[PDB]
């Protein structure tokens, strides 16, 4: 695959995280200090955590050899790194976080707001700037996923910024006279005058202007695809508690009704505090390491009460529909489990959310039976006795399901109790 080795031959700076410890990998050897309270990942994505908690706080500088830096210094050049903010309202006052500017000219990128944007700096009065905004219909209780930003930059050409692959905003650079590049990036969260978190990974700066083929050859290179990602692209874990949503109801919490599981109406969309809570149990794995990947047979527990329940097919009061069966919470031993309630898991990631698809599996077998969808019907559950009513509850389609192949009511998402 020389497309990657082609694109790796023009990194400057590779900022990764080897042996617990932040260093250049670009071969060029940039010196790194990380200076006050950072948290350093051990297990993969090998990230760097930052706060903007007073005092003591964290602080990572990266310092580049004059050489290299006077060269690249009026050409091209490109920026591309996994972010990711927790509690980024869409009030949220302005920040810089990662800054590259020594005297009054440079780049600059920062968060206010639902914006992330990236100043061009040449001297006080003038300056030229690209952002990307987040759609806050989709975000109310906070953009909160990691995403992949990448930003190309050609003096005389364009100056483009990207999202996941995703070309978002485009605008001609224009005449920037007597800008100088600093020999320094600076990672910290410092307030504009008039608590949240930042983790960072695989800061890479490239000598040249990346096309869309490139961007998205390196969005895709650097993530396992094969690990299922919680709703904020995290790594999906078996044994840890989840709420489970469907992505054309994530204003739906999950509740009980007799055997039946039933989604109700969210109070707020703040935090994702409402409803009962499920927990992924392995059953068949080509790996054995907590995550849950593509392909495994898994099942799904959940305490209501003081009970703990599986989620598993059951009769319903009246038909739905043909081939169509509700998923429901029974109090079944694992033979049942493995008939009537184990699912395929594969993972669906899209620009919008990281969420999966779930297919019924056949005697806890990789054998396809059909796939979990969610729906509206009729019928008794409970104390209900004299009338049918209406409940959305999640739905297999048995045998025949190329239709609902590709709807998103079929997408999944699994968001932590933390």
Same mark, same amino acid.
């Given at each position: 695959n020389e497309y990657f080795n082609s694109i790796n031959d023009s990194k400057i700076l590779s900022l990764q995280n080897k042996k617990n410890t932040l260093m250049d990998?670009? /071969?060029y050897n940039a010196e790194v200090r990380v200076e006050g309270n950072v948290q350093l990942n051990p297990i993969f994505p090998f990230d760097f955590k930052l706060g903007s908690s007073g005092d003591d706080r964290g602080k990572v500088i990266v310092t580049q050899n004059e050489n290299i830096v006077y060269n690249a210094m009026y050409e091209s050049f490109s920026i591309s790194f996994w972010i990711r903010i927790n509690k980024?309202?869409?009030?949220l006052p302005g920040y810089t976080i990662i800054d590259s500017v020594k005297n009054n000219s440079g780049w600059s990128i920062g968060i206010i707001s639902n914006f992330l944007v990236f100043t061009l700096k040449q001297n006080e009065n003038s300056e030229q700037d690209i952002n990307f905004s987040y759609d806050i219909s989709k975000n109310a209780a906070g953009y909160n996923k990691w995403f992949f930003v990448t930003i190309t930059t050609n003096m005389m050409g364009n100056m483009m910024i990207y999202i996941n692959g995703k070309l978002i905003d485009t605008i001609k650079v224009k005449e920037l006279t007597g800008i100088n590049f600093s020999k320094t990036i600076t990672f910290q969260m410092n307030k504009i005058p008039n608590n949240i978190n930042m983790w960072i990974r695989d800061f890479y700066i490239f000598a040249k202007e990346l096309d869309d083929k490139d961007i998205n050859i390196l969005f895709n290179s650097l993530?396992? =695809?094969?690990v299922v990602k919680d709703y904020w692209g995290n790594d999906l874990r078996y044994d840890k508690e989840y709420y489970m949503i469907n992505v054309n109801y994530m204003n739906r919490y999950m509740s009980k009704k007799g055997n039946g599981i039933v989604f109700n109406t969210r109070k707020n969309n703040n935090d994702f505090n409402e409803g009962y809570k499920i927990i992924i149990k392995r059953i068949r794995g080509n790996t054995n390491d907590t995550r849950v990947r593509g392909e495994n047979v898994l099942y799904f527990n959940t305490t209501i009460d003081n009970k703990q329940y599986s989620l598993g097919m059951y009769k319903p009061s009246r038909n739905l529909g043909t081939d169509l069966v509700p998923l429901g919470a029974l109090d079944q031993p694992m033979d049942e489990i493995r008939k009537y309630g184990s699912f395929i898991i594969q993972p669906c990631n899209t620009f919008d959310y990281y969420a999966s698809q779930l297919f019924l599996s056949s005697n806890a077998? =990789?054998?396809?039976?059909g796939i979990l969808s969610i729906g509206s019907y009729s019928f008794k559950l /409970?104390?209900?006795?004299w009338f049918n009513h209406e409940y959305l509850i999640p739905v297999i389609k048995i045998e025949h399901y190329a239709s609902l192949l590709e709807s998103t009511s079929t997408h999944w998402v699994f968001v932590p109790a933390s």
């Open positions: 990998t670009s /071969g980024w309202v869409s009030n993530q396992y =695809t094969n077998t =990789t054998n396809r039976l /409970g104390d209900d006795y």
